[PDB]
Amino acid sequence: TQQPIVTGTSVISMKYDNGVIIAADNLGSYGSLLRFNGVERLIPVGDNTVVGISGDISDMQHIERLLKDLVTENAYDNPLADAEEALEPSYIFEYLATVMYQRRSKMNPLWNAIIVAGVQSNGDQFLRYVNLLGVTYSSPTLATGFGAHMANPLLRKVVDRESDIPKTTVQVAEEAIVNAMRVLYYRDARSSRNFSLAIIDKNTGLTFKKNLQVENMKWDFAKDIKGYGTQKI
Template sequence: MNHHQEHWGRPRSDIYGPYNAAIHNAGPHARTQQPSITGTSVIALKYDNGVMLAADNLASYGSLARFTDQERLIKVGRETIVGISGDVSDLQYIEELLERLIIEDEYEHDGHHLRAPHVYEYLSRVFYNRRSKLDPLWNAVLVAGKNDDGSAFLAYVDLLGVTFSSPSLATGYGAYLAIPLLRKLVSDQGDEKKVTESEARAAIDESMKVLFYRDARSLDKYSVAKVSLDGEVTIEKNVKCQHMSWRFAKDIRGYGTQKN
C-alpha cells in the first residue's frame, strides 16, 4: 500500500485545478538563532558642539576576519548618524528600512524633516516589534544627531528593544573597555559642555586603539562621524590607529611557552 501524502484522497483536478505537489517540500518555519557575520563595537561621545561616533571596518565570520571594508556608520536624512554593531545582514536590512523611511518623508516637501529622536523612536519600535515576534534583529544601535531644541542627541537601542540615553555610549566589547575611558570626560549629563571637539576626538582615537589591542574581533582601520549642533554631518573614513606598540605583550605571563 502506498502511504505517501501525494496519493491520499484529494479534490478532483478537473474541478479544483491541478494538485500542487510542491506543498510537501516545504520545511518548517525557522528563525535565525544567532548572527553569522558580525561587526563589533560602536562608540560615541557628546561634546560641546555635537556628537562624535566611531566604528571599525571589520566584519567577522566567527573568528575569521572576513571583510575589512564594512562601513557601519550610516548617514540617515540630513543630520543623523546611525552606528550599528552585530549581524551584518540585519545591518543591511536596517539600512534599507531607514532609506525607505527617508524617501517617504521627503515626498511631502513640507519643510520638515526627520531628526535623530524621530529615527530613534522608529528604530526602537522596529526592534521591539521583531523581538515580540521572537525573530529579533541581532544588532545594537547608536543614534546620534540633534534634538528638536537644537541640543545634541545620543541614544541606544538593542535587539530586545532596550532603550536609554547617555552622554557616552558604546556597544559590544566597547561597553566594557571604551566606556570607562569616555567617562573620564563625560560621566554625567551636562559634562559634555566642558569637552572640546579636539578632546573628544582624542578620547575616541584612544578608545579605538585600546579596542584594537584587546578585542580579537576588531581592526585598526575605522570610521569617525561627527554631527555638529549647526547640522553639519561629516564622516571620515579609513582612519588608522596611530602609534601602535605591542611592547606590553612581553610582560604578559601564563600563555604559550613563556616562563616566569
Template sequence: MDHMPERWGRPRDDVYGEYKAHYSKTGGSGPITQTQQPTVTGTSVLAMKFDNGVILAADNLASYGSLARFTDMERLFKVGEETIVGISGDVSDMQYIELLLERLMIEDNYPQDGHKLRAPHIYEYLSRVMYNRRSKVDPLWNAVLVAGKSDDGSPFLGYVDLLGVTYSSPSIATGFGAYLAIPLMRKVVSEEEDAKSVTEEQARAVLDQCMKVLFYRDARSLDKYSVATVFLDGNVKIEKDIKCQDMSWRFAKDISGYGATQL
C-alpha cells in the same frame, strides 16, 4: 495522532491521498524557523557628546565567526541631513535596517515643508522596529546608536538593541566597547553637564585612544576605523580609513603566559 508538528492540521494520507507539499508555506521541508544566531558580525560602536555635537567611531571589520573576513565594512551611515546611525552586530540585519531607514526618509521626510526627521524621530522609529521583531521571536541581531540634534537644539545620543531596550547617555558603546571603552569615555564625560565643557578635539582624542585599546584587547576588531561627527548647526563630517597610530606590542612580553614570561 502524528506527533510531527509539520504534519499537524493536514488531511490524512491514508484517507485523502498523499499531501501536496507545495501547498504548504514550508514546502514540506519542516516548520518555519527563525535565525537565532548571527553569522557575519561587526563589533563595537563608540559615541560621546561634546560641546557642539556628537562624535562616533566604528572599525571597518566584519568577522565571519573568528575569521576577519571583510575589512572595508562601513557601519556608520548618514540618515537624512543631520543624523548618524552606527550599528554593531549581524551585518545582514544591519543592511536591512539601513534599507528600512532609506524607505523611511523617502516616505516620511518632508524638508520642503520644514518638517525634518531628526535623530529623536529616527530613534523612536528604530525602537519600535526592534521591539516588534523581538515580540515576533525574530529579532534583528544588532545594537544601534543614533546621534544627531534634538528638537530643542541640544546634542542627542540614544541606544537601542535587539530586545528593544532603549536609553540615552552622554557616552555610549556597544559590544566589547561597553566594557573596555566606557570607563575611558566616562573619565571625560560622565554626566550631561560634562559634555558642555568638552571640545571636539578632546572628544576625538578619547575615541582614538578607545579604538586603540579595542584593537589591542578585542580579537574581533581592526586598526582601521571611521569617525562621524554631527554638529549642532546641522553639518555632518565623516572620515574614513583612519589607522590607529603608534601601535606597539612590546607590552605583551610582561603578560603571564605570553612569550618569555611563564605562568
C-alpha cells in the same frame, strides 16, 4: 534572525559641547575568520543623524534599507523635507526602537545593537541606544558589545556627568574616541585597525571620516617578554 553569522563589533560614542561623535571599525567577521574589511557600519540619515550598528551584518543591511526608505517616504508631499519637516534623530530612533521591540516580540529579532547619534533642530545633542531585545537607554557616552566594557570607562573620564558636556570640545572628544578605538584594537579579538568616525555638530553639520587607522601603538616592550615564568631567554 535566530543566530548571527556575519558580525560587526563595538560601536562607541559620546556627546561634547556642541554635538556628538560616533565611531565603528570596518570589519565584518565570520566566526573567528576576519572575513570582510571595508564594511561601513555608520549610517548617516540626512545631515543630522548617524546610525551606528553592531551585530549581524545581514540585519544591518536590512536596517540601512529601512532608513533610506524613511528618507524617501518623508519627502513625499513634503515641501519642507530639507528643512522644518526633515527627519529628526528622535524620529529615526523612535522608529527603530518600535521596530526592534516588535521583532523581539515576534521571536524573530534583528540581531543588532544600535546607537543613534545626531543633533535635534533646537540644537540639542541626541544620543540613544537600542538593541535586539528592544532595550533602550541614553547616557553621555554609549558603546555596544565589547566597547561597553572598555571604551565606556575611558570615555566617562571625559564626560562623567551631564555638566561635563559643555566643558568638552570636539577636539577633546575626538581624541578620547580615537584612543578608545586603539584600546579596542589591542584587546578585542574581533576588532580591525581600520575604522570610520562621524561628528555631528550643531554648527558645522555632519563630518564623516572614512579610512581612519589605529596609530601610535606600543609593542616595544614585547621584545623583553620571554617564557611564561622561569624561562630566561
